Amino acid sequence: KTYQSRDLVLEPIQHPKSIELGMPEVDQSVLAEVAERENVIIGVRPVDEKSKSLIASKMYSSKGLFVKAKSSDWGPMSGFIPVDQSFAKASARRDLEKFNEYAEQSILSGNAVSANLYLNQVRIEELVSKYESLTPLELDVDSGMYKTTATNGDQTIPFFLNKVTVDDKELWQVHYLREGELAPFKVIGDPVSKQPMTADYDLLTVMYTYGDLGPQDKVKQPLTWEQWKESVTYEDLSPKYKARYDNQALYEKQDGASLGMVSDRLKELKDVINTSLGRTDGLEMVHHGADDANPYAVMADNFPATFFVPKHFFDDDGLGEGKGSIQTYFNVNEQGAVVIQNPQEFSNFQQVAINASYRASLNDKWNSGLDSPLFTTKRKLSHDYLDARDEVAKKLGL
Amino acid sequence: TTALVCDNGSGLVKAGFAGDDAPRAVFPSIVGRPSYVGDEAQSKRGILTLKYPIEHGIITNWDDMEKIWHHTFYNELRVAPEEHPTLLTEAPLNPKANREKMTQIMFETFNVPAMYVAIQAVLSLYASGRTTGIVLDSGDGVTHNVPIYEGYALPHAIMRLDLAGRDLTDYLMKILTERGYSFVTTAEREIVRDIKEKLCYVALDFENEMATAASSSSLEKSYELPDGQVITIGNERFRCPETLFQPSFIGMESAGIHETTYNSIMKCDIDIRKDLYANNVMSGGTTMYPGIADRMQKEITALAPSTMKIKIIAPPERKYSVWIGGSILASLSTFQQMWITKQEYDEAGPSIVH
Ligand SMILES: Nc1ccn([C@@H]2O[C@H](COP(=O)(O)OP(=O)(O)OP(=O)(O)O)C[C@H]2O)c(=O)n1
Ligand SMILES: C/C1=C/C(=O)O[C@@H]2C[C@@H](CC[C@H](C)/C=C\CC1)O[C@@](O)([C@@H]1CSC(=O)N1)C2
Ligand SMILES: Nc1ncnc2c1ncn2[C@@H]1O[C@H](COP(=O)(O)OP(=O)(O)O)[C@@H](O)[C@H]1O
Ligand SMILES: [Mn+2]
Ligand SMILES: [Mn+2]
Ligand SMILES: [Mn+2]
């Protein structure tokens, strides 16, 4: 019943809790299949529940490494990226000056535009009735718009929705008080389509099988278009990489600094995920490398995480003989997503996966704020490695 | 002060720190003369002449081997070799003069504090928590059968088969011609190596599998080449690794890996044979094929006495067993008194390694 291996003891989950996730159920299903096909464990950082229908719609592009401004998780701008970061999630409000500069530079540099925020009736009804993120609408005297209120946890701010018709669609344009005067709300839009972008799917980590470890796992620093052209042989490049060698803008938008710290395996798996989601030509959800190689990682912002595992983990002794199944110890939803809620549970999850032959990539930044440094090379050693050393030291007399 | 572990493979070098459960660096054993080593030599293929310093498990080019070791220390591990004791691996049956030269280079060129030279197969057995058993180690340039009793290899019973992954990729390139496909270049060899690693498997019954592939497309697989052209692979999926059991497929008059394992056990004392048969360990990348342990179990069962208990141990990380073994060995406190120190080298010379 209990998972026991050396000093690691896990009790079977008593009463299974249901965790509300922002990732659409259909994307969870795709990732559960990618995990099985590729024989990898894929972890994705949180996505706010209210972003669900925006991602499900498949109408929006999402933010990459050139849009560092945070998305909002409250108000009528929930799921979008406000130009005024005081309307973004708590982490952006904590460093308002830095995140406002991010928002402005992304637009001023051409990697984004300042767009107006339009919401449909379905979205308004969802924010009012489903998530209770917006208070019921009321016609405000003179203004002509529908007043609604929203809280960020500390203060309640009023918002006003004006009925408009864009592309012949009837929508509600979001307005707010800027110096006591009505002003159109601005969100960060895509530099090509001009449409508001949503949050991305940030890979937390990718655990590959030990038998698959090789030169493709070397995490490499981003190279400039010139540094990369000098390092490669043109004839050996596929049509995809030959196009990047022939077009600097194409390399800089799909490769180089835009990926961050990545390995060749991850660049490929990022393509597989994007292709399996049906998200290509500007609408990709995965834009860069995993949080395990992110030097600016914020551990507090990494949970709840959704992990996708190969199907054998779900079998009667998927974690090993007498070790049980992953669902016994971790919350697995209907789509096969293992929901990891905190760093301690992530540490336990990684140890089980390491014991089942899947390799972790540890970020020292994951230990920030922890009572103990769980994510270190020594603490995460494979129990097969530790057990064989105990056996060999005993046999050889060392 | 951590000890270093360096597995000098005929195709790949695996390097890291003792006490770790995996190497930090895995790169190809190649030098591209203008010099480039590992990944950079492979990446700049078009402007370089590539050389493998470890032909068939034995170091043949010491100038190129120093470049590999330098690249390992300074570029890969980012360490000062003069600060870390270093465990190096060697192929079974490595000449005394060869390990003396690698000991001379470790101390005189890199100035290591201490160094130890371990047999690759022995380290693989240690990585499985064992000190007794027979190891089948099949890498890129050589295959070995090494019987071990209480931590020690039995040199008289060691078998060497000059046939490993590299030959299987060349054979796969050869038999792919029989479908109209042409793979002849070094770059094309790498595409075929990838096809081999992804789609090959060992058939339990070769003749019945050949007959099944001859009468249906059920065993066929598709593979997308870098340029997007999709090819179809059929019986080559199992005919390629079949060479390990039938070396006559590539013109070799040598016995297969199942015969050499049996022949190795038979050259050992009767009293330990039961312990070798029950602790057959597979290591190396060329033992990674699906079905190789079941096929080996069956082939050894047909050769061994009827009541002999046969066990094939093929760990999932068997591609790294040699490295893991070295890390386990060099991380043991009671091994810290087996390192050949720089003091002992200055006094005795390269002969100290024996
Ligand atoms: N190899 C990598 C991968 C990612 N990043 C870092 O990853 C972070 C991506 O976080 P965001 O997507 O900008 O923000 P979130 O916290 O995920 O929130 P939201 O998308 O909802 O705005 C910030 C960036 O510094 C990096 O530097 N290097
Ligand atoms: C990913 C990879 C694997 C490997 O095993 O690589 C090693 C080393 C490699 C060296 C040359 C090559 C162009 C460079 C890097 C390949 C590295 O040659 C190999 O591919 C050779 C030739 S084809 C084969 O099966 N073995 C094996
Ligand atoms: N999954 C696999 N299936 C078949 N062959 C494999 C697999 N993985 C690696 N190999 C082969 O194993 C060889 C490398 O293995 P390795 O034990 O590292 O050799 P060495 O130590 O001699 O360099 C290569 O020929 C490679 O193609
Ligand atoms: Mn994000
Ligand atoms: Mn991101
Ligand atoms: Mn080897």
Author numbering:
A (entry chain B): 466 to 863
B (entry chain A): 5 to 38, 52 to 371
Q: Anything the authors wrote about it?
A:
ExoY virulence factors are members of a family of bacterial nucleotidyl cyclases (NCs) that are activated by specific eukaryotic cofactors and overproduce cyclic purine and pyrimidine nucleotides in host cells. The catalytic domain of NC toxins can be divided into subdomains CA and CB, with the catalytic site located in a groove at their interface.
To investigate how activated NC toxins can utilise small pyrimidine nucleotides as substrates, we determined the structure of Vn-ExoY bound to 3’dCTP in complex with actin-ADP at 2.2 Å resolution (Vn-ExoY-3’dCTP-2*Mn2+:actin-ADP-LatB). To our knowledge, this is the first structure of an activated NC enzyme in association with a pyrimidine nucleotide substrate analogue. In this structure, Vn-ExoY adopts the same overall conformation as observed in the complexes with actin-ATP, 3’dATP and two Mg2+ or Mn2+. In the NBP of Vn-ExoY, 3’dCTP is stabilised by the same residues and types of interactions as 3’dATP. With 3’dCTP, electrostatic interactions with the nucleotide ribose change to a single, more labile hydrogen bond between the cytidine ribose ring O4’-oxygen and a water molecule coordinated by D756VnE-switch-B or N759VnE-switch-B. The cytosine base is hydrogen-bonded by M726VnE-switch-A and A755VnE-switch-B as for the adenine base, but these residues only coordinate the N4 atom of cytosine. On the triphosphate moiety of 3’dCTP, the phosphates and two metal ions are tightly coordinated and less solvent-accessible than the nucleoside moiety, which is very similar to 3’dATP. However, in the structure of Vn-ExoY bound to actin and 3’dCTP-2Mn2+, the hydrogen bond network around the ribose and base is weaker than that observed for 3’dATP. This weaker interaction likely reduces the stability of pyrimidine nucleoside binding in the NBP of activated Vn-ExoY, which may explain why Vn-ExoY remains less efficient as CC than AC.
